[PDB]
Design a protein around this ligand. Structure first.
Ligand SMILES: Cc1cc2nc3c(=O)[nH]c(=O)nc-3n(C[C@H](O)[C@H](O)[C@H](O)COP(=O)(O)OP(=O)(O)OC[C@H]3O[C@@H](n4cnc5c(N)ncnc54)[C@H](O)[C@@H]3O)c2cc1C
Ligand code: HEM
Ligand SMILES: Cc1cc2nc3c(=O)[nH]c(=O)nc-3n(C[C@H](O)[C@H](O)[C@H](O)COP(=O)(O)O)c2cc1C
Length: 816
């Protein structure tokens, strides 16, 4: 094609199929990889990436490669050195081999980097994009094939800690490649060089291959079990979840085991009701086009054409899936509905794990709410189960106690670089002023001083902040609970084979854990209610806490209506249920951890290198329980005054980026707080105009209610517009007349100019904000613009916009 990304993909179409169909790669996909061949390919990759990044640094400022210089995100030589130290011992330097094909690849890399840098892209692509695609799965295979530690040792080459979203980063990289200005003959040479790189990898793989040459029901009956957890897994994730679920069966009064439905025939499940209250749980991963895992095939087919009655069987299903597949969790949903229709009764709602989001936390949530449901559906053991042991340190020096820090002891005081999620930097609150002009809601512009923190950031990157719950809430909880909050204590995990030895940094006081470590504002989960049920003296409240710990009957309805809809925090529950008198150590054991909150950076580092600007709306509402609830992070930051008030924060890289060429036009859409990152963009753009660089058009599409209410940055945006930095300033006011006006209408208004920019000027579209379904609205608006002004059918216009998305030109930064 015309654009470099599409042209390279079309050129490598065939050699990619040939590469992934190489004998070694096919054996890798099936999981049949050996440690020796893996060491061989890893050493070869060490040599190859060393040569490649050597030439990259040699040409990191040559215009034929400069847009592709992402050392902090893509480079692999350090991770490959770590993996060589792992796989080849401490003296890996002299032990790793250097195969002839590896030498040929390195020689071609050096030839390119030395006398033909315009072709270097073709190699980088061939490697780096490839590492961001299949590489995410291969690791999950190796972790099981070679059995490596879960810490990722030996697989650091497959880990990109600075790439939060690999798909969006591949979009950005495609955009940077399309930035490369080149003659068509140079483009053809580049495609041929990408073919050459693929062929080098293919023959490397070829050479490396040349250097290699009973009834389960009656068994539970004969072993005394009542819980069995079948798993349908291919890369071990469902195995992990099923084994972790079986381990906790012995820790609730029952006992359970895992099971592979590839060695049993599940027709035996017909004779399962003959066990004194038993449960059958499935952890089913889905693959292909909604097809089951291989081991579950015999299961799946058996589910198809059968109707053997299994009345009395109690079951529960959890599905491992991924939202980006248009067959989401087909296997889990199928097993769930088929088991229901066959005559079994369900105990807990089917879980739908999302690999696109967070599968581990999803499974943790599902299990946390799952166990109390089974408990209160089968009866009770007086809730006689614990997880942490309390140890009170009545005499202890203060330099040994955690006072609120997140990483190492006293890390908040001896602040030493680097700073990240585990060691946040305590930024100084420079400014904290009100952006909102009215009185409906509070919107604030904070400035964090990170002067000597050595922290870098770009416009569009995010800043996360560790807040602290309101101290009045902590004091009230301590009073009503009748417990001393200044008691230095610790909670030690008695499950030895777990690195997680504490529910939060210990030793520390109950007050510190309630202020900085525990979320005491979000609605309580089912598990904490079922565990507090044993501390309710009145039966009219103990039975209420018991019923609110199940998925069936009036229980789930009452839980959703009284705790979820009303949004009652733990203090409100202790108030409305005066019988609850639990110990504070158990409450600390049960309460979830206080999470950090992210915000879009509202400043360009090119004009504010030692400060990070945040634009945030304060969360504060009247809950249906009468009580007024305050957002943790927003109120916490609002309380920060320049009279030194520190904020523990860190910076997470995002793929939201301005175009590399200053001449490229931008179309930013951000109603409300979604203006935050663009406030940075414009600044940088303005700065680029001050440096004498030719800057293209810059269009902003902001949206608010009334011009006198919540017009954010009105004066700054006006100054930007009159200085010429901001080309157009189109604001939609949703409450300034009869019919409301949104930014989609303003886009539809400027359809002709927008199309001319997109088609003739190669513009970049940006969308940001927490506005409801705003994404699809702007998306359909651009669909219609492209369909009309580019003589296109609707289908080809939607494909045009999705292509823009692929080329890294239609970017999103939405939240909720
Ligand atoms: C990448 C990313 C970027 C972000 N950028 C920004 C930004 O630039 N500016 C900004 O302000 N926020 C931004 N956010 C959101 C931010 O992280 C927080 O979610 C938000 O600021 C609230 O934080 P909080 O701790 O004060 O509220 P929390 O203590 O976390 O409570 C929030 C909960 O309160 C509930 N709630 C809120 N209002 C009501 C209501 N009327 N009635 C009933 N329930 C209600 C909701 O269920 C909500 O989930 C971003 C989030 C992400 C993931
Ligand atoms: C295990 C074998 C392999 C598998 C399963 C595999 C799988 C994939 C998949 C699924 C994609 C699409 C990702 C996307 O565009 O969203 C992809 C693209 C790609 N793969 Fe492969 N791949 C394999 C081998 C290789 C090898 C050996 C290389 C080169 C060293 C490579 C280079 C690429 C590149 C560069 C892309 C990006 C193409 C583009 O979008 O322009 N792949 N691969
Ligand atoms: C080839 C392949 C196909 C997949 N297809 C789907 C799918 O169709 N629907 C879905 O929800 N998830 C799909 N996934 C996501 C997996 O279900 C998800 O990664 C799951 O956690 C894997 O479980 P396991 O590692 O235990 O085998 C697919 C994954 C792969 C590698």
């Amino acid at each position: 094609s015309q654009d470099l990304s599409e042209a390279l993909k079309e050129a490598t179409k065939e050699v990619h199929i040939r590469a992934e169909n190489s004998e070694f790669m096919r054996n890798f996909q099936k999981g049949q990889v050996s440690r020796e061949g893996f060491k061989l390919v890893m050493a070869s990759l060490y040599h190859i990436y060393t040569a490649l990044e050597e030439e990259i640094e040699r040409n990191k400022q040559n215009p034929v490669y400069a847009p592709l210089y992402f050392p902090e995100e893509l480079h692999r030589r350090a991770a490959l050195e770590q993996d060589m130290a792992f796989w080849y011992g401490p003296h890996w330097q002299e032990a790793i081999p250097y195969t002839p094909a590896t030498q040929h690849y390195v020689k071609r890399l050096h030839e390119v980097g030395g006398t033909h840098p315009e072709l270097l892209v073709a190699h980088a692509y061939t490697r780096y994009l490839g590492d961001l695609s299949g590489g995410q799965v291969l690791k999950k295979i190796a972790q099981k094939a070679m059995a490596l530690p879960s810490s990722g040792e030996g697989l650091a080459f497959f880990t990109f800690p600075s790439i939060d979203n690999p798909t969006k980063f591949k979009q950005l990289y495609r955009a940077r490649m399309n930035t490369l200005e080149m003659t068509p003959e140079v483009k053809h040479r580049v495609t041929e060089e990408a073919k050459t790189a693929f062929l080098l990898n293919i023959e490397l793989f070829e050479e490396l291959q040349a250097l290699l040459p009973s009834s389960f029901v009656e068994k539970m009956k004969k072993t005394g079990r009542n819980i069995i957890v079948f798993y349908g897994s291919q890369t071990g994730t469902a195995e992990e979840f099923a084994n972790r679920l079986s381990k906790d069966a012995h820790r609730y009064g029952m006992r359970g085991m895992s099971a592979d439905p590839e060695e049993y025939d599940l027709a035996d499940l017909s004779s399962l009701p003959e066990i004194d209250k038993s449960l059958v749980v499935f952890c089913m991963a889905t693959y292909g086009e909604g097809d089951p895992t291989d081991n579950a095939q015999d299961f799946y087919d058996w589910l198809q054409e059968t109707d053997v009655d299994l009345t009395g069987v109690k079951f529960a299903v959890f599905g491992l899936g991924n939202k980006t597949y248009e067959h989401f969790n087909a296997m889990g949903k199928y097993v769930d509905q088929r088991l229901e229709q066959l005559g079994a009764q369900r105990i807990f709602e089917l879980g739908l794990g999302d690999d696109d989001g967070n599968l581990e936390e999803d499974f943790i949530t599902w299990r946390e709410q799952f166990w109390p449901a089974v408990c209160e559906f089968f009866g009770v053991e007086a809730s006689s189960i614990r997880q942490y042991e309390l140890v009170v340190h009545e005499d202890m020096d203060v330099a040994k106690v955690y006072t609120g820090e997140m990483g190492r002891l006293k890390s908040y005081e001896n602040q030493k670089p680097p700073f990240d999620a585990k060691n946040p930097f305590l930024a100084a609150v420079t400014a904290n002023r009100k952006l909102n002009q009215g009185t409906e809601r509070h919107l604030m512009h904070l400035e964090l001083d990170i002067s000597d923190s050595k922290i870098r950031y770009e416009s569009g990157d995010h800043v996360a902040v560790y807040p602290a719950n309101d101290s009045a809430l902590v004091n009230q909880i301590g009073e009503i609970l009748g417990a001393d909050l200044d008691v230095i204590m610790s909670l030690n995990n008695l499950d030895e084979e777990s690195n997680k030895k504490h529910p939060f940094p210990c030793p520390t006081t109950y007050r510190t854990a309630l202020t900085y470590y525990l979320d005491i504002t979000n609605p309580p989960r089912t598990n904490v209610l079922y565990e507090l049920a044993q501390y309710a003296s009145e039966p009219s409240e103990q039975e209420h806490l018991h019923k609110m710990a199940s998925s069936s009957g009036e229980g789930k309805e009452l839980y959703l209506s009284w705790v979820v809809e009303a949004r009652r925090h733990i203090l409100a529950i202790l108030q409305d249920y005066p019988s609850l008198r639990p110990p504070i150590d158990h409450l600390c054991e049960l309460l979830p951890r206080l999470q950090a909150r992210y915000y879009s950076i509202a400043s360009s580092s090119k004009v504010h290198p030692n400060s990070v600007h945040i634009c945030a709306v304060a969360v504060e509402y009247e809950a249906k329980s009468g009580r007024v609830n305050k957002g943790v992070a927003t109120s916490w930051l609002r309380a920060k005054e320049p009279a030194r008030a520190l904020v523990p924060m860190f910076v997470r890289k995002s793929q939201f980026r301005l175009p590399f060429k200053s001449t490229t036009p931008v179309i930013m859409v951000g109603p409300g707080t979604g203006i935050a990152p663009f406030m940075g963009f414009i600044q940088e753009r303005a700065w680029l105009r001050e440096q004498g660089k030719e800057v293209g058009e810059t269009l902003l599409y902001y949206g608010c209610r009334r011009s006198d209410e919540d017009y954010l940055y009105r004066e700054e945006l006006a100054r930007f517009h009159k200085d010429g930095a901001l080309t157009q300033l189109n604001v939609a006011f949703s409450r300034e007349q009869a019919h409301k006006v949104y930014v989609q209408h303003l886009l539809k208004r400027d359809r002709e100019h927008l199309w001319k920019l997109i088609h003739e000027g190669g513009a970049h579209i940006y969308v940001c904000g927490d506005a409801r379904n705003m994404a699809k609205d702007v998306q359909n608006t651009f669909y219609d613009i492209v369909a009309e002004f580019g003589p296109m059918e609707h289908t080809q216009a939607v494909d045009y916009v999705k292509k823009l998305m692929t080329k890294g030109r239609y970017s999103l930064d939405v939240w909720s």
